[PDB]
């Protein structure tokens, strides 16, 4: 044991702090992404998600299901669409979908049941990553790694859910980062 994970909780090498792309880089355990791509990814997502859903028929439901997400396409004042992460996630291997979805939750979808959750507040949104065995908020409003209890993460999402609705469930393959090491895997290994 490292004795204290918080000792160095965060993303190793970070070269892109401005938009959520930062949290994404940390979440992905490694940047390797630019802001320009986010804009293009978001745009491509709209065109892709629009055509993909439109073409596939989106069974309409898929439309109303996703539509739940925040529109506005995206900004350029220092923020990117959360959907951009989804596009990168999908292309990364994993996928990102809205959690609010009462259909999934009812079917049996828990907030903690996941590994990576995303929250959106009005405009600005944050990225939640499950570090070790607990959820940790990452963005900037937390002024750092805000440890969120399993009973809190769900309670929190519930609060935001009841307050409005802006949560995205990250499903798929999630890479490990420094936090993953703090969980157990110590540097010593060679």
Swiss-Prot record:
Domain Josephin: 6-185
Tissue-level expression: Ubiquitous.
Enzyme class, first EC level, given as a word: hydrolase
Active-site feature positions: 19, 124, 139
Topology in membrane: Peripheral membrane protein
GO biological process, one term: protein localization to cytosolic proteasome complex
Gene Ontology cellular component annotations, sorted alphabetically: cytoplasm; cytosol; lysosomal membrane; mitochondrial matrix; mitochondrial membrane; nuclear inclusion body; nuclear matrix; nucleolus
Catalytic reactions on record: Thiol-dependent hydrolysis of ester, thioester, amide, peptide and isopeptide bonds formed by the C-terminal Gly of ubiquitin (a 76-residue protein attached to proteins as an intracellular targeting signal)
Subcellular localization, as worded in the UniProt entry: Nucleus matrix; Nucleus; Lysosome membrane
PTM per Swiss-Prot/TrEMBL: Monoubiquitinated N-terminally by UBE2W, possibly leading to activate the deubiquitinating enzyme activity.
Record key words, sorted: Hydrolase, Isopeptide bond, Lysosome, Membrane, Neurodegeneration, Nucleus, Phosphoprotein, Protease, Repeat, Spinocerebellar ataxia, Thiol protease, Transcription, Transcription regulation, Ubl conjugation, Ubl conjugation pathway
Gene Ontology MF annotations: ATPase binding; cysteine-type deubiquitinase activity; identical protein binding; K48-linked deubiquitinase activity; K63-linked deubiquitinase activity; ubiquitin protein ligase binding
Linked pathology: Spinocerebellar ataxia 3: Spinocerebellar ataxia is a clinically and genetically heterogeneous group of cerebellar disorders. Patients show progressive incoordination of gait and often poor coordination of hands, speech and eye movements, due to cerebellum degeneration with variable involvement of the brainstem and spinal cord.
Domain notes: The UIM domains bind ubiquitin and interact with various E3 ubiquitin-protein ligase, such as STUB1/CHIP. They are essential to limit the length of ubiquitin chains.
The protein's name in its UniProt record: Ataxin-3
Gene expressing this chain: ATXN3
Full protein stretch here: 1 to 185 of 361
């Amino acid at each position: 044991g490292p004795l204290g994970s918080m000792e160095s909780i965060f993303h190793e090498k970070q070269e892109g702090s401005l938009c959520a792309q930062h949290c994404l880089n940390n979440l992905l355990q490694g940047e390797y992404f630019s802001p320009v791509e986010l804009s293009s990814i978001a745009h491509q997502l709209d065109e892709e998600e629009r055509m993909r859903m439109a073409e596939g028929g989106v069974t309409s439901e898929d439309y109303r299901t996703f539509l739940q997400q925040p529109s506005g396409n995206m900004d350029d004042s220092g923020f990117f669409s959360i959907q951009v992460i989804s596009n990168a996630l999908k292309v990364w291997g994993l996928e990102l979908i809205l959690f609010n979805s009462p259909e999934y939750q009812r079917l049996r979808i828990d907030p903690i049941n996941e590994r990576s959750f995303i929250c959106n507040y009005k405009e600005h949104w944050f990225t939640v990553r499950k570090l070790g065995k607990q959820w940790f908020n990452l963005n900037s409003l937390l002024t750092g790694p805000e440890l969120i209890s399993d009973t809190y993460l769900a309670l929190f999402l519930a609060q935001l859910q009841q307050e409005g609705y802006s949560i995205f469930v990250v499903k798929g393959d999630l890479p490990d980062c420094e936090a993953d090491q703090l969980l157990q895997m110590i540097r010593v290994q060679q």
